[PDB]
Structures are given as C-alpha cells and as structure tokens.
Design a protein around this ligand. Structure first.
Ligand SMILES: *[C@@H]1O[C@H](CO)[C@@H](O[C@@H]2O[C@H](CO)[C@@H](O[C@@H]3O[C@H](CO[C@H]4O[C@H](CO)[C@@H](O)[C@H](O)[C@@H]4O)[C@@H](O)[C@H](O[C@H]4O[C@H](CO)[C@@H](O)[C@H](O)[C@@H]4O[C@H]4O[C@H](CO)[C@@H](O)[C@H](O)[C@@H]4O)[C@@H]3O)[C@H](O)[C@H]2NC(C)=O)[C@H](O)[C@H]1NC(C)=O
Ligand SMILES: *[C@@H]1O[C@H](CO)[C@@H](O[C@@H]2O[C@H](CO)[C@@H](O[C@@H]3O[C@H](CO[C@H]4O[C@H](CO)[C@@H](O)[C@H](O)[C@@H]4O)[C@@H](O)[C@H](O[C@H]4O[C@H](CO)[C@@H](O)[C@H](O)[C@@H]4O[C@H]4O[C@H](CO)[C@@H](O)[C@H](O)[C@@H]4O)[C@@H]3O)[C@H](O)[C@H]2NC(C)=O)[C@H](O)[C@H]1NC(C)=O
Ligand SMILES: *[C@@H]1O[C@H](CO)[C@@H](O[C@@H]2O[C@H](CO)[C@@H](O[C@@H]3O[C@H](CO[C@H]4O[C@H](CO)[C@@H](O)[C@H](O)[C@@H]4O)[C@@H](O)[C@H](O[C@H]4O[C@H](CO)[C@@H](O)[C@H](O)[C@@H]4O)[C@@H]3O)[C@H](O)[C@H]2NC(C)=O)[C@H](O)[C@H]1NC(C)=O
Ligand SMILES: *[C@@H]1O[C@H](CO)[C@@H](O[C@@H]2O[C@H](CO)[C@@H](O[C@@H]3O[C@H](CO[C@H]4O[C@H](CO)[C@@H](O)[C@H](O)[C@@H]4O)[C@@H](O)[C@H](O[C@H]4O[C@H](CO)[C@@H](O)[C@H](O)[C@@H]4O)[C@@H]3O)[C@H](O)[C@H]2NC(C)=O)[C@H](O)[C@H]1NC(C)=O
Ligand SMILES: *[C@@H]1O[C@H](CO)[C@@H](O)[C@H](O)[C@H]1NC(C)=O
Ligand SMILES: *[C@@H]1O[C@H](CO)[C@@H](O)[C@H](O)[C@H]1NC(C)=O
Lengths: 108, 129, 132, 108, 132, 129
C-alpha cells in the first residue's frame, strides 16, 4: 500500500465553519480510500468509503472527493460534536495503511 | 486489496458454488478424476470399466473430446421451469443434480433414442446424396 | 445486535506472550473476513493483519509484526484470535478486532480470492502492555 | 463549461512556506484545467496545463493535481516573486470559463 | 519573436462602437485559433470569444457578449479583430487577444472540427472605456 | 472543448489533407460528381460519356459498386519506395496523383492485361471443372 500523507497536522476553526483536510498519495491509488473519525475513548468511526460515499447511518454533514493521488475530506460545518482525529486510509493493497491522521478542534 | 490463491481449484470445492463459477475448473476436476495385488487388480479393472462407461456415452452423444457439449434435445420445462440465469447464477452442482435426479435416465434416453438416431440416419442419407 | 467482546489483554514482560480473543455476534462471523489493528499511546492507528472469511485460507501481515504474531479463528466459538508471541516493548498498544466490508472467498478465475474493502465494524479493543 | 470555484479568496503565507489553492467544479470536467498566474500590470501567465503539466519554460516551483471535480494548485515555496492571482480555468466546453481567482501574497 | 500589438482602444460613449485590431507575428497566425478575453477593473478575467484557425469556420461567444460583438480575422494582415458594437457601460474592460494551444481544423469523422485546449500566448491588451 | 461543422465535407476540401483522412468522404465526393438547348444537349451527352467511361473501367477491373477496391496487381516500388504509412498519413490526394502521374496508364494497363485477363480465363476453367 502507498504511503498516505495528511495536512495540516493541526486543523481548527470556529463552530459552523467549513473545514477541510488535505490527503495525498505518493502514487496513484485510483479510489481505494476510507475516511475514519476518532473521538477520545472511541475506536475510529468510518464516515466515508470509496473516497466519496457516506457509510449507512452517517448524516450528510461530510463530503469527500478526489481520485488518483489527491483527495480531500470536507466538514460542511464543524460542530463541537465533530471534534476528533480524521484518518485517510488506503486499501489498494493488503497493508491497508493508515495515514497520519489530522486533529480537528474548535478554536478558543 | 485482494488476496489470491495459487492457481486453481484444489479438488471439488466448487461443488457448493454456483454452476456458472464451478464450470471454470471442469478441466481440472475431470483430469483429476479420470486419472494385496489381487484386490488392487480387481480395483484396476473396475476403474477401467467406469472410465470406459463414461467414454462410451460421450462417444455416442457426440460429446467425445469435450467437457462441455451442446445437444439438440429441447429442455422440457416440466423438469424445471427456472430460467437460464435462475439456475446457473443461483444454484450449485450438488443442488442442481438433486433437483433433476429423477430425469437423468429420461434425458439420457432422449439423447440417444432421438438425436443420436437422427444424426446417424440423416448422416448416411446426406453422404449417399 | 452486533457486539465485539475484546479481552485477553493485560501486562506482560518483553519476551513473554499472550493471546487475545475477540468474541462476536450479531453477524455471520464465519463468513466475513476480519482485521487486526492497534494504536499505541500518542500514535495513530496501525494496521496489523487480515484473515479471510470461511476458513481463512489467506492472510497478510504488516512488516512490523510478521514473524512475531499469528492470526487464527474459530467459526463455532465465533472468536477471532491474535497470538502475541516473543513480544517487545514496542508492541504496547490497544489492539482492536474488526470486520472487513466484505472479505469473501469469491470463486473467480478458477480460484478463490478474498476481496477486501477495509474495516467497517469493530469493538473498542483492549490494552496490552509490554514492559519491565 | 462548468462553473469553477476557488478557495480561500485571500491566501497568504511567509516566504518559503508551502501554499495551496483549492479549486473545484460543480460537475465532472475530467481533466480540462489550466492554471494561470497574474501579476500587477501583466496578463495572466500559464503555469500548468491539463491539470498537471508545467508549461515549457516554467520552473519546477509549482505542481497541481486532482481530477473529476477536485483540483489543487501547489506552490512549493512562496517567494515574493510568486505574488499574484492564480486562476482555475475550465476548457471542457467552448465557454472556457475562468474561476474567481485566488490572490496569493506575503504575510506582514 | 512572438509579439502581439494590441491597439484600437480608447474611450467611447454607451451606444457607440469601435473595433480592436491585434497585429501579431512570430507564429503561423493563419493556422492557429485565437481567443478574446477581457478583464474589468476589480474583476477577474472573463472569456469573450473564440475563432478557429484557417479561415475561422467556427466560433463561440460568451452569453455576456453574444449579439453585441463579432470576431473576424485577416490572414494576410495577421490581424485579429473584435467588432465592439452597441456597447454598454458594463463593457468597460481591458481586452486581450490570445492564441489557443492548438485551434486547428482537423479532418475527422468526415468533417472539420476545431480542437481547443485554452489560451497560452497573448499580449497585454488595451483599455476600452464605455462611459458618459 | 471542440467546435464542429455540421455533417461532412462540403466539396473537395479534403483534397489537401492526407489521403487517409480524405478517404472518409469518398461517398460524398463521388455522389456529388456523378450526379441554349443544343449547347446543353451536347454537354449532357458528354457528361454521359464521361460517366460511362469510368463505369466501364470499374466494371472491367472488378470494382463496380465500390469506391474502394483491392486489386491483385503488386506495387512496383520503382514507382515510389514510400511505405504505406509514409504515403497515407503524410500525403494529400493532389500531391499523390502528381507523384505517380506518369504511371497511370502503366498500372491501368497492368490491371486489365494481367489480372482481368487471368480472372476471366481462370473463371471459365473453374466453372468447366
Ligand atoms: C478447518 O480445518 C482445517 C483443517 O484442519 C484447519 O486448518 C489447519 O490449521 C492448522 C493450524 O493452523 C494448520 O497447521 C499448520 O500447518 C503448517 C503446514 O506445514 C507444512 O507445510 C509447509 C509448507 O511450506 C511445510 O514447510 C512444512 O514443513 C509442513 O510440511 C505448519 O507449518 C504449522 O506449524 C506451525 O504452527 C503450529 C501452530 O500450533 C505450531 O505448533 C508449529 O510448531 C508451527 O509453528 C511455527 O509456525 C508458527 C506460524 O505462526 C509460529 O508462530 C511458530 O512460532 C513456529 O515458528 C501448522 O501445523 C493446518 O495446515 C491447517 N490445514 C489446512 C488444510 O489449511 C482450519 O483451522 C479449520 N478452520 C476453522 C475455522 O476452524
Ligand atoms: C475567406 O473567404 C471567405 C469567402 O468570402 C470569407 O468568408 C466570408 O466572410 C463574410 C464576412 O464575414 C461572410 O458574409 C456574411 O454572410 C452571412 C450569411 O448570410 C446568409 O446565410 C444565412 C444563413 O442563416 C441567412 O440567414 C442569410 O439570410 C443569408 O442567406 C451574412 O448574414 C453576414 O451579414 C452580416 O454581417 C455583415 C458584416 O459586414 C453585415 O454587413 C450584414 O449587414 C450582416 O450584419 C448582421 O450580422 C452581424 C453579425 O456579426 C451583426 O454584427 C450586424 O449588426 C447585423 O446584425 C455576412 O454577409 C461570408 O458568409 C463568408 N463566406 C463564407 C463562405 O464563410 C472569409 O472571411 C475569408 N477568410 C479570411 C481569413 O480572409
Ligand atoms: C461458496 O459459494 C458462494 C456462492 O454463492 C460464494 O459466494 C459468492 O461467490 C460469487 C463468486 O463465486 C460472488 O459473485 C460476484 O458477485 C458480484 C456482485 O456483487 C454485488 O452483489 C452483492 C450481493 O450480496 C453485494 O454484496 C455487492 O456489494 C455487490 O452489490 C459480481 O459483481 C461479481 O462479478 C465478477 O465477475 C464478473 C465475471 O465476468 C466480472 O465481469 C465482474 O467485474 C466481477 O469481477 C461476481 O459475480 C458473490 O458475490 C459471492 N457472494 C457473496 C455474498 O459474497 C462463496 O464465497 C463461496 N465460498 C467459498 C468457500 O468460496
Ligand atoms: C489541412 O490538412 C492538414 C493535413 O496535415 C491538417 O492538419 C492535420 O490534420 C490531421 C487530421 O486531419 C491531424 O491529425 C491528428 O493528429 C493527432 C496527433 O497529435 C500529435 O502530434 C502533433 C504533431 O504536430 C502534435 O502537435 C500534437 O500535440 C500531438 O502530439 C492524432 O492524435 C489524431 O488522431 C485522432 O484520430 C484517431 C483516428 O483513429 C483517433 O483514434 C485519435 O484518438 C485521435 O482522435 C489525428 O491523427 C493533425 O494533427 C493536423 N496537423 C496539425 C499540425 O494540427 C489541417 O488541419 C488541414 N486544414 C484544414 C483547413 O482542415
Ligand atoms: C436464488 O436467489 C435467492 C436470492 O435471495 C435466494 O434466496 C435463493 O436461495 C437462491 N436459490 C438457491 C438455489 O440458492
Ligand atoms: C512527411 O512528414 C514530414 C514530417 O516532418 C514532412 O516534413 C513532410 O513534408 C511530409 N511529406 C509530405 C508529403 O508533406
């Protein structure tokens, strides 16, 4: 699996703002990308699979797009409830590598 | 990401998958099946008879050399009213053979008594004229 | 409902061993492929290993664990196992069991292959500490 | 041609930092994207064409990627000389629509 | 070398007209397709129109200018023209002439088509003001 | 982004493009070309003779009904040593016809004297036996 990178490592905004996470592959992975969100004390929650499709039961508060090497996760409005670390995972090959993770929090 | 086996079906495993998918390894399964002294001697002769029995029918039916051959006997939907896809993409070999177990001798008879008979009669007539 | 009960953890010395056991119900454990992942304190989530569904005729290990860990499963107990042998202090992490979106042994091309599309179901893991 | 959007409208950094511009289409444009850079008093300069290929004579100080609806322009290091407005233009259909343009400047 | 000389501008009243003329050399003007774009003060760059190469057997206009502007060309003078008629104050902008990356009349499918991939060569334009 | 014409080549324009591309509209060009009183009457008769002249040769050569027909006359590379792609993807109809203008009567003769002659002789012999 191709190493994934995420940026910025520390992402913050006021409540209600539109917040995005950059994620890239060093090599073309075509589409094999999942987005997870971790909250303190809880295993990472799958929000989006196949780089764009929301997981069943997940509200339409998030989107994602991109293909090839350039991807992005979009938080339509950042609420206190959405604070957590978002992970960019590739599953093209049987290493299912996770990216570094980006911490998203509320400005204070 | 996909994990893969080596090359092909080991032995019989496909028997519980759809007949469509299972058809892929008929070449494998056929080859494997096709191929103290006195007891073994008896077994050898029996193996030959079983081997040749199948070859006899495949010869007569015009199927020799094939593991898949089309006949000219129509399917009587009384035997099963399932469509092509309702069988091949939805039922295993073990299940299918049971479904039509009681029609085996019927259809085998029809292949020989009707089609083989026709093909041999008409063949001579065509060669003559 | 679906619930994973993940235990077998605790504290061991480097050079020792344990085995984790993730009991699960609410789904066809015997059919779906499973994952192991771990998260060390202060770190992100590291993928450990995958085992296919059915009898588990295919595996893959992270280079960080290959040769030191083994994956197996019991389809009657509905338990997923991680054999944590010859451990080092670097192996301290919370380990999780997870289910792949599919993991099934498809008959294609004349052979069985396991299609994985990533974890989507899991419990909360258990802490395994390796220290002295 | 599909309307392009760019964000943020005002993008700044210190000299030498890595600066990126988000650009998206409301509909799939596949690859038909040019990047231009305008400096005061000068017509916009084409830097990257076909969403990823540098124009002949342009130094390897810039990259771009993305396909479909999500694209990005990357300034490897923002120098005072690179201050200008960068435009995301679509040329899939004969309207050759330009995006709003993003102004990139040095923090002070 | 390649140089576009873009003139014919100035100040006109709304309801009046002018024509711009962009003389060019250094390239096969007669063969490549050309563009018109404009930038109003305080705004970004707006695409105005395109004309194909050769004799210009195909055009497209922005909806903001269609019916008010016309594009033509003279392959012997090597000049690109914009007929700026019945103008409104909203038409104040610096107008530029540009060359497409290709713009050629390919014979494909039994017919001529013009392949465009966007402007890559231009001058600095000229200011046209419409006011009263 | 691509601008397009309506349907197909208007008339003769393809003459200056490669023969490959120009071949696309042979159906168009052929149809258009193929189809006071006394002067016009004379012209009509002349048009007929020109029309039929071409049809005669196409008939004899076994090409009637086709706008593209392969013959069985080998290309003598003395006429031109260019390869297939060096001609068809690099030269126009106007240019090509000039290149081999002085071989027109030669090759036309060869088609009839050698191939047509053979095809008619052998045809009868095959029908007889
Ligand atoms: C459904 O039923 C099937 C059928 O029983 C069952 O699968 C079987 O599981 C057992 C247990 O996992 C498998 O046994 C293993 O077999 C291999 C095969 O070795 C042969 O083949 C290799 C091919 O290269 C040769 O090199 C080799 O010399 C042999 O010829 C063995 O290598 C395994 O031994 C290791 O694991 C044992 C686990 O107890 C150890 O005790 C043993 O000492 C070996 O340990 C070494 O390897 C470990 C790897 O993790 C390592 O951790 C140790 O430290 C040490 O280095 C083992 O005997 C058997 O092959 C399976 N059968 C088939 C057909 O796959 C399924 O489990 C069952 N399914 C369910 C859901 O219940
Ligand atoms: C190579 O050589 C060719 C051959 O000469 C040359 O192309 C020719 O250019 C002229 C000038 O552009 C073209 O003339 C135009 O022809 C159209 C055709 O009208 C007929 O067909 C339409 C089909 O729907 C019918 O509806 C119509 O009734 C006719 O039957 C005319 O409509 C044009 O007239 C307008 O433009 C004139 C420009 O001077 C005006 O004087 C005239 O009053 C009309 O103006 C109106 O339209 C304008 C549109 O911009 C508008 O601005 C005005 O305000 C007003 O509304 C015009 O006569 C001729 O067709 C071309 N020939 C071919 C075969 O394409 C190339 O220019 C040359 N190339 C080079 C590089 O030199
Ligand atoms: C024991 O036997 C069973 C037999 O049912 C096996 O399970 C099935 O195995 C077949 C192949 O052997 C699988 O077939 C594939 O199904 C895909 C359809 O997926 C859609 O539908 C399922 C419905 O559950 C959804 O879950 C899924 O998300 C999709 O919505 C097809 O797309 C596949 O087509 C492939 O082959 C064609 C060949 O031309 C290619 O062109 C295609 O591109 C593609 O590669 C294929 O038909 C089937 O999915 C399996 N079922 C399940 C539920 O997974 C068992 O796996 C088997 N066990 C063992 C031990 O092998
Ligand atoms: C008067 O006649 C000339 C004849 O030369 C015309 O100019 C050429 O016209 C042909 C088609 O009629 C064009 O051919 C196309 O070329 C493409 C190659 O592009 C590469 O090479 C050029 C070299 O200059 C580079 O500039 C370019 O960037 C590329 O590197 C092919 O890819 C095209 O293939 C198309 O057709 C096949 C058919 O199967 C498809 O499969 C392909 O996908 C593709 O669609 C095609 O072969 C040629 O490019 C023209 N030359 C130039 C320089 O543009 C004049 O246009 C003509 N004038 C008039 C009035 O019509
Ligand atoms: C045919 O498909 C349906 C799909 O729901 C399934 O329920 C049924 O069991 C299938 N038949 C066989 C033979 O398995
Ligand atoms: C053949 O192609 C070459 C490519 O450079 C060109 O120079 C030459 O003129 C071509 N021949 C014809 C008949 O145009």
């Amino acid at each position: 699996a191709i190493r994934m990178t995420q940026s910025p490592s520390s992402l913050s905004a006021s409540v209600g703002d539109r917040v995005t996470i950059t994620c890239q592959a060093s090599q073309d992975i075509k589409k094999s990308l999942n987005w997870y969100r971790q909250k303190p004390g809880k295993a990472p929650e799958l929000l989006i699979h196949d780089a764009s499709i929301l997981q069943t039961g997940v509200p339409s508060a998030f989107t994602a797009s991109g293909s090839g090497t350039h991807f992005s996760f979009v938080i339509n409005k950042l609420q206190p409830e959405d604070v957590g670390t978002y992970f960019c995972q590739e599953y093209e090959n049987l290493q299912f590598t996770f990216g570094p993770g980006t911490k998203v929090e509320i400005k204070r | 990401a996909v994990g893969i086996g080596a090359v092909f079906l080991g032995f019989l495993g496909a028997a519980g998958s759809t007949m469509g998918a299972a058809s892929m390894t008929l070449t494998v399964q056929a080859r494997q099946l096709l191929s103290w002294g006195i007891k073994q001697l008896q077994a050898r002769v029996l193996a030959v008879e079983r081997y040749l029995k199948d070859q006899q029918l495949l010869g007569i039916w015009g199927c020799s050399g094939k593991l898949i051959c089309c006949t000219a006997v129509p399917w009587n939907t009384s035997w099963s009213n399932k469509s092509y896809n309702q069988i091949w993409n939805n039922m295993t070999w073990m299940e299918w053979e049971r479904e039509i177990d009681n029609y085996t001798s019927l259809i085998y008879t029809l292949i020989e008594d009707s089609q083989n008979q026709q093909e041999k009669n008409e063949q001579e007539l065509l060669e003559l004229d | 409902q679906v619930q994973l009960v993940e235990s077998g953890g605790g504290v061991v010395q480097p050079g020792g061993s344990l085995r984790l056991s993730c009991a699960a119900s609410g789904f066809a454990f015997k059919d779906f492929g499973m994952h192991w992942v771990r998260q060390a304190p202060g770190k992100g989530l590291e993928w450990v290993a995958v085992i296919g569904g059915g009898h588990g005729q295919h595996q893959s290990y992270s280079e960080s664990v290959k040769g030191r860990f083994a994956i197996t499963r019991d389809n009657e107990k509905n338990k997923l196992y991680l054999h944590m042998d010859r451990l080092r202090t670097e192996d301290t992490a919370v380990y999780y069991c997870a289910k792949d979106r599919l993991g099934r042994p498809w008959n294609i091309g004349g052979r069985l292959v396991y299609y994985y599309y990533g974890m989507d179901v899991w419990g909360q893991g258990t802490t395994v500490t390796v220290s002295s």
